[PDB]
């Protein structure tokens, strides 16, 4: 049966790659509250997720192969690992694979003050919806760990890329802020993940066009204590951002005409010597 032939094609590499599926792996130490955060955050991701439902003896900083195997067998690239210990309490290790080898670990522990979905109220909302992001804190643009976490969360929750967006679907914002500004040598403020639902009220400042928007907290109030980090090899990072690769003086004019701009140079007519011919010669004067 050629159902499989379609599956291999859907898995194999594409010019415009699919949405990156996420896998939520529970390790040996998956306590109940971690499964709660996993349910909530995975819900925030779905329909692009798979949840595995058995304990897995995976230590992502000692033997990285099983994660690669699961990123193969489940086409999912992004992955999550449920771990806890007396050293690292309520830990989520967020994986990223390139090809199928590992591109990123990261080690985000959940502080005990987290709140779930069920701790809040809910309004009308639609699952599988494209979220809008806000990233507070200047260190996201600059600091290597914070650049890594910003790209991590964008790549995790951006869903399917689109060029036309329905204003009805702008229904919730994912907000991520660093605990505070800091200098080099101070220990890495933990990042604050919050999910907010949008509400728009009329405001007649700019007119009918732009409303005033105010937020309501829904869902996973999480605080993320940053731990050990696997940074991709610079060759893999410089090869993982290859554009698919699909002109001078040529412009696609509106209405689709190839037009060439022709660019002739200067015309120094001062360097031209007019023909010194007998009429212009005043020596042949008459009178």
């Amino acid at each position: 049966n050629a159902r499989a032939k379609r599956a291999l094609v859907k898995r194999e590499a594409k010019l415009v790659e699919n949405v990156k599926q996420a896998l939520f792996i529970p390790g040996q130490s998956c306590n109940k509250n971690l499964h709660d955060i996993m349910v909530d955050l995975s819900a925030l991701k779905k329909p692009d997720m798979k949840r595995f439902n058995r304990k897995n003896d995976i230590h992502p900083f000692e033997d990285m192969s099983p994660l690669e195997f699961f990123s193969e067998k489940n086409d999912c690239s992004l992955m999550v690992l449920m771990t806890s210990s007396k050293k690292r309490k309520n830990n989520m290790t967020f994986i990223r694979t390139f090809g199928y080898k590992i591109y990123d670990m990261i080690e985000l522990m959940v502080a005990d003050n987290f709140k779930l979905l069920s701790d809040f109220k809910k309004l009308t909302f639609t699952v599988g919806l494209k979220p809008m992001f806000t990233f507070q804190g200047a260190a996201f643009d600059t600091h290597p760990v914070y650049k890594q976490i910003k790209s991590l969360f964008l790549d995790f929750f951006r869903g399917e890329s689109t060029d036309l967006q329905d204003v009805a679907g702008l229904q919730h914002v994912i907000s991520m802020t660093i605990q505070g500004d800091f200098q080099d040598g101070e220990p890495l403020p933990n990042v604050l993940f919050r999910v907010y639902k949008l509400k728009s009220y009329k405001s007649d400042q700019g007119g009918k066009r732009l409303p005033r928007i105010e937020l309501v907290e829904i869902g996973p109030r999480l605080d993320f204590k940053i731990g050990r980090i696997h940074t991709p090899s610079p060759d893999m990072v410089t090869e993982a951002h290859k554009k698919p690769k699909q002109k001078k003086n040529v412009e696609l004019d509106i209405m689709g005409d190839k037009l060439g701009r022709i660019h002739m140079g200067k015309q120094d007519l001062g360097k031209l010597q007019t023909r010194k011919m007998k009429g212009l010669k005043s020596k042949f004067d008459q009178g």
């Binding site: 194999e12 590499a13 594409k14 010019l15 790659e17 699919n18 990156k20 690239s77 990223r96 390139f98 090809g99 502080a111 979220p131 809008m132 992001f133 806000t134 990233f135 507070q136 804190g137 996201f140 790209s151 964008l154 790549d155 951006r158 890329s161 060029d163 036309l164 967006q165 329905d166 204003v167 009805a168 702008l170 914002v173 907000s175 802020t177 605990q179 505070g180 500004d181 800091f182 403020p189 604050l192 919050r194 907010y196 949008l198 405001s203 400042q205 700019g206 732009l210 409303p211 005033r212 928007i213 105010e214 937020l215 907290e217 109030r221 990072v237 993982a240 951002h241 290859k242 690769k245």
Partner: protein
């Protein structure tokens, strides 16, 4: 009711992913778990960022169509859809680009000899005997004629020759990705 909210450092935008990256000054003493005004502070700050994001986003160019509801796979005439740019922020790809497919020896032959690839006219060719169009191959293809034509068995001989030419084609192709 205010909507024109500002802050000393400008906000960059990645409207392709609907993201606004703030880079202003945050104080630890406003954010840490000692502060019970923590959640209100964060909600207000992210409300401000969302407000600027939506201000830019609704002020995008936007396309509207005239197609009826029962159209094919698009937007309806009534709904005006924002047209988002490409994502400015560069994010790691999932898999390497599919360029890994190589180039075969038939193609080098066809590039040395002045070969032009065939046109794809179709499977059907005119069977001049029976006044029909019979496909070259496939379901009752014009190559499965001698198999039940009414004139050792020569039919099995054709079938074996044809099958071993199929084997040869596969044999040749499976040496091409060793190139």
């Amino acid at each position: 009711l205010p909507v024109t909210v500002e802050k000393p450092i400008p906000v960059v935008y990645d409207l392709g992913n609907l993201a606004a990256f703030d880079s202003n000054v945050l104080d630890k003493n406003d954010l840490d778990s000692s502060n019970a005004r923590r959640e209100e502070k964060i909600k207000s700050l992210t409300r401000d960022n969302v407000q600027l994001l939506i201000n830019q986003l609704l002020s995008l160019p936007m396309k509207t169509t005239t197609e009826s509801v029962g159209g094919t796979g698009g937007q309806s005439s009534v709904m005006t859809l924002l047209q988002l740019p490409d994502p400015t922020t560069d994010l790691p790809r999932e898999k390497p680009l599919p360029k890994a497919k190589a180039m075969t020896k038939w193609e080098k032959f066809a590039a040395k000899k002045g070969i032009k690839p065939k046109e794809r006219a179709g499977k059907m060719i005119y069977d001049e005997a029976s006044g029909e169009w019979v496909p070259k191959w496939g379901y009752k293809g014009a190559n499965k004629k001698l198999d039940d034509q009414w004139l050792i068995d020569p039919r099995t001989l054709n079938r074996a020759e044809r099958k071993r030419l199929v084997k040869k084609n596969e044999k040749q192709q499976r040496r091409n990705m060793k190139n």
